[PDB]
Design a protein around this ligand. Structure first.
Ligand SMILES: *[Se]c1ccccc1C(=O)Nc1ccccc1
Ligand SMILES: CCCCCCCCCCCCCC(=O)O
Ligand SMILES: CCCCCCCCCCCCCC(=O)O
Ligand SMILES: CCCCCCCCCCCCCC(=O)O
Ligand SMILES: CCCCCCCCCCCCCC(=O)O
Ligand SMILES: CCCCCCCCCCCCCC(=O)O
Ligand SMILES: CCCCCCCCCCCCCC(=O)O
Ligand SMILES: CCCCCCCCCCCCCC(=O)O
Ligand SMILES: CCCCCCCCCCCCCC(=O)O
Ligand SMILES: CCCCCCCCCCCCCC(=O)O
Ligand SMILES: CCCCCCCCCCCCCC(=O)O
Length: 582
């Protein structure tokens, strides 16, 4: 368009425009005060208004990248604060923008953002809604400079909704704290998903991502023909490559182009997209990404005729191997939305291995006649794992299920630090509580998503400080066999048991007035240390000791003299447990 800033303003509107400008400048100028960013936002919005009133007004015909870079380069403290980032201003576009993009800081060193009390948060929201929400948007944007800005805005809208609902409630905290925890978990998971997809693309190549996209899109749009699914795969791979490069405008343009193509070809893709396709360009691609799978066509035949029984199986495969394998993955995935994507990828890899082996064999047709038999144990392994773990969850409840997982995973990898073990086992228990309440048809996708986020968290922590070769192997594996690698871990037979430390099992009266969450964390930390000290202890011995611990805590937390109760009863409990275990 003649004026890109005016067109963007008119499509997005003033509120969204200002929010996104604030996000972008905070993602680049991560160290500048909130008031300075607000001043910059007001200036940019004012210029955009001049452009909207008259497309021929001065500087309105310049590109968005040129305008953004110039505004960045007018910041007076650029050298003093950012150093070599100021040197980007001596380059011409697009070198200047590429330099600015390269000089973003993934891990800025700012203090952690502390959650204020519910009442002060609600009071600040009530006094000035706009400044409260904008300041927190600035704080989050300056800490996650690669996070997709429109998704940040979509999170911010729900934050406003949560505050609006819960700050007029009878019990403000009990309303708002679950919503804040939900949103924080959700945002951290989304950022991890972005980084994870980009790193997997870089490490394992475009072809693996295209296989993943074939599976996911065939699940999403089972009535679509394979040619349309392949078109969507190519375009989505392009979009994700460019978004992994990190240029916000180029990434947003690619996403918008894909969204409007999908909206104009709804008749060939899905029957569930009308509402998303009536939505603004800002929300369209996100809406499309979040919509549930379409209904699969009825009475789909088995893959046997085309992929096992055909006499031309090897000819069709060797003609164009990846198209044939994509067709196999398409037909398999469209029939099985109940599968994780990685399970379907395992099936595709198995079929590819069998075809490579058999089409060079003396009798290929006889060779691959039973390839579908190989799919049965691969399919049933995660189904059986889900069955077992959800049975144990319904028997135990979330906390005692977390304790079971705690014992199991400490026995498997005792070298891992206790905080990591506790945090990851708690999150795995949360995965259990989340996914075990779905019907089976949806249980495996849920597990895949939430396990992927939890396992990624673990892998990132363990890479910051490596301690176990098996964890490193699982964490560097292909994401298709990352979870199977983790499920295949066994009890560490070579572990030398940790020696007794009296302080570790010394307890005080503060435990009685800790929050329930913190008290649970302390009890679980002590349980991990106990399993590290006595790894051979049977479940009956451990359960007897835990019952003794619960009795001791209940008695001394209601004792008139808590301190000496804890000391004396703790010496008694420690000696009694030590005599029971062995
Ligand atoms: Se940028 C920055 C970083 C740390 C402390 C202060 C600043 C700042 O004031 N930047 C600024 C000055 C003038 C106009 C806009 C922004
Ligand atoms: C739930 C997050 C815990 C850490 C941050 C504590 C304060 C949360 C307030 C969030 C206000 C909205 C932020 C936004 O606009 O994105
Ligand atoms: C990579 C996550 C580091 C921890 C981030 C602390 C602040 C999170 C605020 C919660 C809501 C926004 C989450 C997000 O921006 O991704
Ligand atoms: C001569 C080619 C025969 C190949 C076997 C399929 C014949 C029917 C084609 C239409 C159904 C499958 C199309 C598709 O792969 O999406
Ligand atoms: C200097 C002016 C900068 C303002 C331009 C910001 C444009 C952001 C567009 C985001 C649109 C996202 C569309 C999508 O993801 O599908
Ligand atoms: C959020 C990743 C997709 C970015 C582009 C949005 C366009 C959606 C096309 C359909 C792809 C669905 C991906 C998904 O499973 O979320
Ligand atoms: C139409 C595009 C086809 C893309 C290639 C599909 C091949 C399926 C077999 C490979 C499956 C494993 C993928 C992976 O390495 O993670
Ligand atoms: C033999 C190592 C294969 C790695 C892939 C593991 C796939 C997980 C499903 C497990 C089903 C049993 C077959 C198998 O172990 O592969
Ligand atoms: C501790 C988690 C409780 C939920 C049960 C998970 C059982 C293993 C997950 C199976 C599905 C994962 C996705 C996949 O690997 O295909
Ligand atoms: C803290 C290290 C634990 C790493 C191993 C956790 C296993 C996660 C795999 C999925 C969980 C259910 C499947 C299983 O129990 O085998
Ligand atoms: C339902 C609440 C039950 C809480 C159980 C927590 C288990 C913690 C184990 C602590 C073991 C103490 C024995 C010892 O120090 O030797």
């Amino acid at each position: 368009h003649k004026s890109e800033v005016a067109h963007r303003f008119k499509d997005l509107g003033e509120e969204n425009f200002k929010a996104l400008v604030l996000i972008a400048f905070a993602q680049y100028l991560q160290q500048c005060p909130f008031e300075d960013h607000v001043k910059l936002v007001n200036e940019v919005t004012e210029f955009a208004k001049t452009c909207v009133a008259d497309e021929s007004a001065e500087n309105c015909d310049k590109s968005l990248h040129t305008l953004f870079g110039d505004k960045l380069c007018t910041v007076a403290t650029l050298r003093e604060t950012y150093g070599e980032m100021a040197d980007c201003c001596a380059k011409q576009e697009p070198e200047r923008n590429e330099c600015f993009l390269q000089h973003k800081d993934d891990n800025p060193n700012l203090p952690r953002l502390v959650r204020p009390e519910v009442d002060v948060m609600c009071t600040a929201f009530h006094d000035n809604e706009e400044t409260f929400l904008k300041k927190y948007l600035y704080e989050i944007a300056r800490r996650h400079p690669y996070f997709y800005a429109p998704e940040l805005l979509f999170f911010a809208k729900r934050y406003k909704a949560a505050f609006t609902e819960c700050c007029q409630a009878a019990d403000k905290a009990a309303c708002l704290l679950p919503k804040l925890d939900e949103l924080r978990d959700e945002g951290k998971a989304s950022s991890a998903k972005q980084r994870l997809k980009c790193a997997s693309l870089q490490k394992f190549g475009e072809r693996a991502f295209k296989a993943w996209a074939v599976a996911r899109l065939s699940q999403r749009f089972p009535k679509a023909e394979f040619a349309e699914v392949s078109k969507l795969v190519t375009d989505l791979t392009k979009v994700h490559t460019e978004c992994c490069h990190g240029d916000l405008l180029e990434c947003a343009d690619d996403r918008a182009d894909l969204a409007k193509y999908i909206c104009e070809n709804q008749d060939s893709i899905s029957s569930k997209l009308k509402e998303c396709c009536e939505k603004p360009l800002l929300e369209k691609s996100h809406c499309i990404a979040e919509v549930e799978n379409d209904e699969m066509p009825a009475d789909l035949p088995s893959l046997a005729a085309d992929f096992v029984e055909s006499k031309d199986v090897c000819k069709n495969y060797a003609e164009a191997k990846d198209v044939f394998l994509g067709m196999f993955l398409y037909e398999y995935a469209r029939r099985h939305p109940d599968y994780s994507v990685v399970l379907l990828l395992r099936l595709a890899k198995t079929y590819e291995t069998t075809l490579e082996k058999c089409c060079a064999a003396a009798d290929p047709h006889e060779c691959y006649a039973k390839v579908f038999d190989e799919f049965k144990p691969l399919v049933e392994e995660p189904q059986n794992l889900i069955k077992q773990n959800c049975e144990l969850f319904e028997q135990l409840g979330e906390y005692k299920f977390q304790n079971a997982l705690l014992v199991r995973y400490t026995k498997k990898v005792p070298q891992v630090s206790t905080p990591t073990l506790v945090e990851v086992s708690r999150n795995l228990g949360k995965v259990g509580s989340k996914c075990c309440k779905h019907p089976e048809a949806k249980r495996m996708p849920c597990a895949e998503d939430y396990l992927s986020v939890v396992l990624n968290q673990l892998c990132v922590l363990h890479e910051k400080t490596p301690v176990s070769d098996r964890v490193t192997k699982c964490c560097t594996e292909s994401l298709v066999n990352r979870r199977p690698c983790f499920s295949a871990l066994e009890v560490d037979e070579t572990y030398v048991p940790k020696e007794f430390n009296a302080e570790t099992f010394t307890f005080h009266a503060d435990i009685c007035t800790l929050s329930e969450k913190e008290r649970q964390i302390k009890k679980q930390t002590a349980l991990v240390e106990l399993v590290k000290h006595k790894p051979k202890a049977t479940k009956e011995q451990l359960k007897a000791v835990m019952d003794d611990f619960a009795a001791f805590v209940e008695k001394c937390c209601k004792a008139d003299d808590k301190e000496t109760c804890f000391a004396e009863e703790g010496k008694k409990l420690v000696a009694a447990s030590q005599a029971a275990l062995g």
